[model samples]
Target chain A: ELSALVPVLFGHAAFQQLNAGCQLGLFELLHERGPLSAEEVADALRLPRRSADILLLGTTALGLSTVTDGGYRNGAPIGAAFRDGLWPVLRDIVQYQDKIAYQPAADYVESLRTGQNAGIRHFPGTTRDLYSRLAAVPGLEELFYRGMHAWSQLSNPVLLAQPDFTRVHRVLDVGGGDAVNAVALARAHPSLRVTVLDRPGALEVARKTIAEAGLEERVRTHAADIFTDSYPAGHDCVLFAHQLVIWSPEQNLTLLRKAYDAVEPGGRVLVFNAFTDDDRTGPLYAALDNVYFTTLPFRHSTIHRWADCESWLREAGFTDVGRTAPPGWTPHGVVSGSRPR
Target chain B: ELSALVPVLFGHAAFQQLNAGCQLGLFELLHERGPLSAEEVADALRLPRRSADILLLGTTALGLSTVTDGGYRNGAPIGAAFRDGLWPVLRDIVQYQDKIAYQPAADYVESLRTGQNAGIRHFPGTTRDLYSRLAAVPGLEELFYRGMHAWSQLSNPVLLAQPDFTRVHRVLDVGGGDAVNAVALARAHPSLRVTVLDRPGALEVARKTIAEAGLEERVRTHAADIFTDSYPAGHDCVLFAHQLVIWSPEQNLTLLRKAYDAVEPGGRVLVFNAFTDDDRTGPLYAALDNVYFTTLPFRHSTIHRWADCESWLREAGFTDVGRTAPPGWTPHGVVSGSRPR
Candidate 1:
């Protein structure tokens, strides 16, 4: 039925129900407590009776929660997130969408019409990309960190799960700001030593995180322009964690070529990021998320199709290029290759 | 998997995709000339190649449109709109959501927490209700007209389909701004003569529309406050089309009591509007659309439960009060009663 459009037509309100519920601790309350009546939910959440009725109807109708025996409980999806211990990560993503992405997404039409990141107008800056404006915009830096930290934690399971990390003794994590991945890698693969290569400012965070995690001995920092500066010699492997998606195909090829020339013979290159399917019909998450990428990030930033990333790997002179789809719901995965012996 | 949250998590983006598609005429173009490749769509919609790629993938993934044989076409829901001859109405609704509701919707959380229509702050007004602000804001009146016209056209079938309309002779359409329903009523039932009662400003449009429709004899306007004005003699049915949803329950009872006092014994009163189910769990259309009702209209404005409206009719001293659910996707219906003889 055309009723299918109801969700699409009222999609913003759908998000609002989730956000307002999260804001009011509706889901968490239901999760911690028993199946609660609407009146009980109102008292617990400190909401007006009408607000509780409206919010419960919204969440219940959307299947975010369920009504059983005249009382409500977390729906299957909400229950599963807590069961899998990803509720924190899901909560962070919800907060990010609420605070950052929702408003700018209104500019998606103008962004498409002009082929510009027109949503940049929402933030205060003359910069071309969102990254440079993060520090300048008050409180945006912290907001970015919590959400992005969750994203990293949620997706890096795929990156750290790489079997290649078992064999690679030393790794170069190109443009790996904050050493989030570098520390994770060193901790997960005890024998592996990693260098987080980034600019001077980002390397500061990388150094601090390495020390905070007591990975200072294995995970180290290297401050250098990922594109303009020459790669410091030493590593057998070059890893681009969530990096390639932010640049043009030509730029990706250039970075991959840089990785090719930098790594030792027969060494590996692992490009870890979210991806679209080769057909581009979608895994859906990437397709919907693309709206934010289209409107707010650097103009070239996107979730590139895995096949395209593999081609960049091949064109950069890497051999045996392949993609490993992750063992989770997110569209994140690894596209890996080898520098020829 | 928790991936079901993708739509809710990126709900704004999902809407932006639909909005952008509607803005760019992507769906209509596919309806008229699609099953065309992405390049052709880019050229036709005047989108850059990348923009087309992103836009098509979005609509495709949302099932708003579908891809087949390397080409795109309207999906079932979209094709259904066309086949049912409701595309123009749907398009109007989309435009309305884009221009009016989308941005203000960002305040849903604040609106819920405070139990206020905080999103009203987006408009240029101190008015407690959206209707008064409509005239004061430049361009809003015209936008409101176009959107509300479509809503009336889409929902008025229920008002017209009421079995009571057949026996009722002279009809008083209380708060029937611009005679949208009046014109439909006069045309649907030739024997019925209808008066469009509203403020003078709205009656001006009612006069113009009645004359244009050449229903001047059967459809006419009466300029008076809906709450304050006295009813003229000789009307058998007092109709409140799309009105009860805008006022508080007390206000609704007062209005109905007034209708009771005005109409002759054995005369009828019809309360027409969208409604939530009694269980308050759903008819998701009302549940989701409640966001707009909560955030933009008067603080008391909402889609009341069908049972509530029926109670108001009964308490207003009208007997034989009952509900008539419409045979359409919209949650619109009639609550009707007869003046006691």
Candidate 2:
């Protein structure tokens, strides 16, 4: 009878408890040390036994821990969480929610009422959107970017696996934050060179990332405003990886048109993001992204349906527009269009 | 790849979006109005089109609304939501969470670190537990109680139906806030009279409620601290309805021993509250309750396993202790022990 209320109301508690357990290395400790009593856990982590007990038991309730013979151990779910390669990303997302999103979400109704990002007020700066505000606060900026990068690391693999980049010599990765995708694509297609186009702040991170990956020769960063700046010319494949969803249809159309102009004849524009189904019921991730977008003061963005993008692609003078759920991908998909030869 | 993280990390977004949609009456409007365009919705609700559009799209993403021919209406899940008799309770809980729990939850890690109700500082008064602080704020208290009352109305029916009270003459409802259960029990069985034992403030509310129910003659309230004061004696059934889980095991055992003393030899001490499985992996409701317990200043209390409660009951000098999952209840059950005959 009360099942529905559980997730709506107490989800935050579960998130917090799981986060606390992970932060205390409770999961890793139990994983490595096998079964241990709460007192032993407290002693190992130098925390009060009561807190350790609460956290261990709370996490146990979350299905993240197991109890046997009066001691706690890692549950099978924890192993699945680790082996799935997405738990760290989830941990990062929860951290960002804890640090950045928790307060603003309280004002979500107000945000909806005023059509403003009520959460932006929590940050000190008088900036409009979260991205610009984040620029001034490098500490928060690092955490936010780390979460996004972790997300990219988890979801970008499928995008990398798809799209025969072998045929495309040079690729333009638009709004490619930190060049994670660019670096990976450049590494995979040795003959390909990739240019990551994004804001100056992200380009700075992209430069460092590309250099760290020793792909500085093949992958480079271009600093420009996606809305105002003209796209640099000559790339055969223009990719919007994890982008576009943070934009309105008009903005996406304008950007796609720019990509159309930037590409040579027969070149393709590949837009990879978490897109909703045509019916727009949910892919869960997209709905979440939509909520994240509401927290921002920019033009509202959501998971666009493939048909919506196809229409935009055709309107931008592209041909053969199509969408594909690449094999092995849970949420990542490709929507692409070809420029006429 | 990232499906698991959706509920853990982005669950709040779903929560906030649903709340906003419900607050705007988007669901009811769609349910009644059939299908309305975003502009029509904005017009009807006197909201900005942009906000309505965001909300409608969000609700659609949440599967609470459907889009057809560019208009919105109720979806299947929402039909299930209403039919299940939990949405109203969920809505109330979400309102309380949005108003009270959201900010304090951000301090969960610190709460764990310091062993304090870290979120308590958000409230003005220097009260230790949430109940005392809530007593000072009538508006929030009303909302919290409404949510609790709704929860009680839904789950208490099962408790009300089980445990044959045919032979019982009088009952004591421990921590029976507002006398909802007491009045109901008195009205159900003419031979039964109920005394609600709780804090002074709660007893005041209970007095008003009992008077309104016109059962003031049979249903009465006693204002006393359960820890410091003795329970009024001679009750045949000492019923702890939805109360024990808010206290520590030691405190619960102590209270049960008191109940053991308060009841007559042939009478019973009945624990009618949410109980965890021995494994505690969960009926999700209990798990959620466990998380909520961590946020409070009181000794962390979660739904206790039947084995633990049986041990406590045996220690309290009760005989024939047993647990039962009264049929047809969604998270309601009983653990009862007869006082030595």
Candidate 3:
């Protein structure tokens, strides 16, 4: 009856076990050397024999690892991660949870108590944006950025497969930090030429990323203020890739208005990122992941629902507004609307 | 494909939802009132509007709470807890998990690295055991002991139902801190009179609890060193209630040998507590719970497997050693053997 309590009650312990495996090298060790015994795992991982025992028991109990005869091996879930070649991605995700999210999550209640992202107090910086304060911690800069990169790599396929890309030629990628999506779009749609418009610091990272991809010819960089500075003209599509979730409804409307003003009248604007369900019930992924959005991103940041974004698009005077979602539990998708010619 | 990561990836967030609901009075409020609207839940729980939405989405996603036509209600797992009058126990369990166990669990890796209960460093005390340091922190003394009491209340039934009780009289409850099981035995079996053998501090608590139960005449108390002194004589049964899990195998063997000398001819010793499975794959509960045993209790504390306990009994010169487990996922069970007449 109380078996349900096993997951929730030991939830933190469960995560730690996963994090410990990634950190302590159990999964990789087991993957490299099929079915190692506990003693073999202990000697390999340099863990105390008892420590290895507890860890095996922890992961095995959680079904992340399994035992056969006398040997322990990574369970199917972990093996799937290895097979899909997402081990680095999964490793970064676990590290983010362990170092970035675990403590601030304790602030979930307080963040809810007041209608503010109170967890930001854990990181030192005058910056209200969680992204701006990463340099405050010596070791955590890339940990946070790398987590963002992994999420991008995992979900960017939906952004690249947008059907609108076929008709649209010159693309305006706003807040297109690191050129992750820009490079992906350019690589996936060879006919597409993109301009990444963002702040100078981000543009520098974009420039280097574009250089690395040999997409400098297809992708260019433009630096300006997203809110104050008017968009540089002559683009058929304005792509807000993974951007709108960081601001309030009015601010998102303002960004969409900018997109409307930036794009040619006959062109379209695609708002790309994960969207919550209209009923606010859940697809499960958005619901649990929203804790991070609510507590750290920005005071106004939230994964706005599809209807909420659609209404904002309409408010900015776009017609034929609709959404395209990937076929799965992933909340990632593309929502688009056209400005009447 | 990657949906399996949901529980482990957001495991901490999943817990915070449960912890937040309990702390914010959402579950209890939903239980007491009919299904409440989000606004109603916020008003009653004094949570911000968005905070209530996030909490509901999180719990609903995890299947700990569910949504109806226009309202939210406690899910079946929580409903069962309320129905069975285990809400207080569940609440205490959540608090212990949230406040007492969550952060220290992060040390799971290092605790393994050193073969020590390194998480104990989180608390300050000269004493080596976890129980001795509870009073050192404010608002936490009761949280820890109350958790122990709740676990006892939930699992003591296995101890009470031992068929060995049918043939035995005057019981010796070794290390019977607070006499939780001693009182349960007397209350369950009318023919039983129990002596709670423990330290003076625990015996005082035993006296108070016995008086509170009005079983003071039947459930008496004894004060002595469990190790340095002999267990009192004239007892036909010796009970180690939730005790063996705390000491080393040698110490447990030593304790069993002492039980062998103290009981009369054909008197029995019933080792009561949760036991790991023989193969150690898991019933899942003992495996996850072992993290706490490994990292918080005494350095040597561990949930010994059933075969280990049975072997120890055989070594102690007891015969016909056998075990009795309840029908469920609960690991709580009793193992018994008798001294030769």
Candidate 4:
């Protein structure tokens, strides 16, 4: 409950502006022009003097800044200081959160309990995915992409060295947007040919980035669902990346079995994603991130809601299930099972 | 938005049990008991091991306690240790917040934006004056009364001593509940007869407590609203103790004028309550506490919400309008006005 409410305290009216301003590079203005009067700060930032004053006074009251001699400056070493260009990154995320996510997230507990998005009611005529709309608005898109990249930065580190990919010859990366992980893995291992798959639009974006990275030989893009479309057969390994949680258990199992049947005997199937521990304790970020996910209709459920992936693998007729924590993320566990020879 | 959401967090499904456990004195029990294994601790507290373990682990995970060697102990001094017994008092006051005076006080912005109760939904079904309802519910009454007593314990020394009462012949404590202040004031000045006026139920309780303290001669009780009933006039000094917030300006000013009209020249009307500073910066607790008063329709519309008392007293034909911070509790600011000669 404290965890849930802390966000509100941090997001309440004045508080939200302070956070957004910090993320929008407003604090950079203050930092460079420290000890500036409200009018001076306002002049520099190109905002109204009173708005700057409220921002300053509120930030002062909130301990986001210090006030002296009718002038204001950054308060303490809160995350706001470290956020430079990253402030825009944080701003994008905060904007996405405030404009698109906060309302639904505010009522997420009910959404989880009822298993309903009610997203249309909240967003009203806007596409619920937000990413689609976000793609069109350059500012929003920058925020969305940077926000996602920042997340991957925070999240991918945990999965870095956890799973043993040595036994696999080729890798199938499903819903592999922009293929950051594939490029990362290919760089980590020069011999691995990783198939990067996503829907058409995201795949187009992924291809350009992968091509620019000059990994066209090792990493390729594909588009189709494993459920309705043909699997890339004889692939020695299949990787879920961040794909698993966007699915139902039955659907996830169906994909796992299809991967198993598509591969040769003794072939490996690897699942890598943000997963909670079997006991469902937290590294916190997974559950916290669900606030964003809850706004999407089919994506309301999270990995923490899954009991255990090892059991799912066994039930899907895979053997020798192995699990390990990735290097950078505590809760990003990876697991793999090999087909019987 | 933050203020609106705080109550929900306080009463959330995840929080209520922990709050209840706190109310039941669980953490304080652990504080006094040192660390004990699950079964031993459960046995001492007359709780089942499983239920006790839930409380223990939840508190532990919340960083309120440490779990070691299968026994649980307090982790830090955050809220569990210091606020265990006190949570109920805080919660009850939070509960009565609107019931007594401040109705959904977070709506203060809307009220401030437009001078209304933001729509005064009448206090639901009156036992009009609150003393009966407060004293009727044992848990609630105890929490509230005890909480006020706790406030007196903290604030009395400084608050009471700060004001000069030497010239006053008699003191009327208008709207004083239970004479917690009256008994203390009478004890502080043996010659002072402090008349406490409140609803009948609170007055009865006050009378008994005063008799037990053997200060009956110096204390008396009157049951009436200063608004509808004739205020016992001619007192040299009268104090409105924590009464302003429960009323609107129409009501409060009516009382203020009556006090001015009845008191002799040079007599004083000392408004005793918490005051938000003019800049609305905050002493934090008092500022946040304004939430309680404005929401309770039956309670005063929050004295602080009315024009600041010092300003109102001057408008009501008083001279020498003065304000002082008293040393009784954490803080009780006195806004005193002298009747014009």
Number of the top-ranking candidate, with DockQ as the measure = 1
By DockQ thresholds, what CAPRI class is model 4? incorrect
lDDT of candidate 2 at residue B97, scale 0 to 100 = 69
Q: What pairs collide in candidate 2? A: none
For residues A1-341, could you state the per-residue lDDT of candidate 4 as single tens digits? 12222222222233243443554355677777777777787677665443353345445555556666667776663335254333444444454544454444434333433455544355434664444544555454444444555445445644556445666768887667777777777877787888877666666667776887899998999887657876788687777766666666787888888877777678777777766544323334443444444435353345533346777788888898877674554557677788888
**Model 3 bad stretches (over 4 Å):** A169-172, A193-211, A214-234, B197-208, B220-234
Estimate the TM-score for candidate 3: 0.92
Tell me the TM-score of each prediction against the true structure.
0.96, 0.89, 0.92, 0.55
Ordered by DockQ, highest first, the candidates read 1, 3, 2, 4
> What lDDT is reached at residue A183 by model 3?
89
lDDT of 3 at A32: 93
Every candidate's fraction of true contacts kept comes to 0.73, 0.44, 0.69, 0.01
Q: After superposition, how far is residue B40 of candidate 2 from its true place, in Å?
A: 5.7
lDDT string, candidate 1, A1-341, tens digits:
68888889999999999888888898899999959999999899888777788889899988999998989999989888889899888888889988889888988998888899888788888989787677676667667766766788888998888989988988999988788888888999899999888766566656777898998789888888888998867788899988888788898999999999999988999999889888878878888888889888778778899989999999999999999995767899999999998
Clashes of each: 0, 0, 0, 42
Q: What is the DockQ of each candidate?
A: 0.76, 0.41, 0.62, 0.06
lDDT, candidates in the order shown: 0.86, 0.75, 0.84, 0.57
Model 3's DockQ score: 0.62
> What are the iRMS values of all candidates?
1.1, 2.9, 1.5, 10.0
Q: Residue A321: error of model 2 in Å?
A: 2.4
When 1 and 3 are scored with TM-score, the better candidate is: 1
Question: What value does the lDDT take at residue B105 in candidate 3?
Answer: 75
Best by TM-score: 1
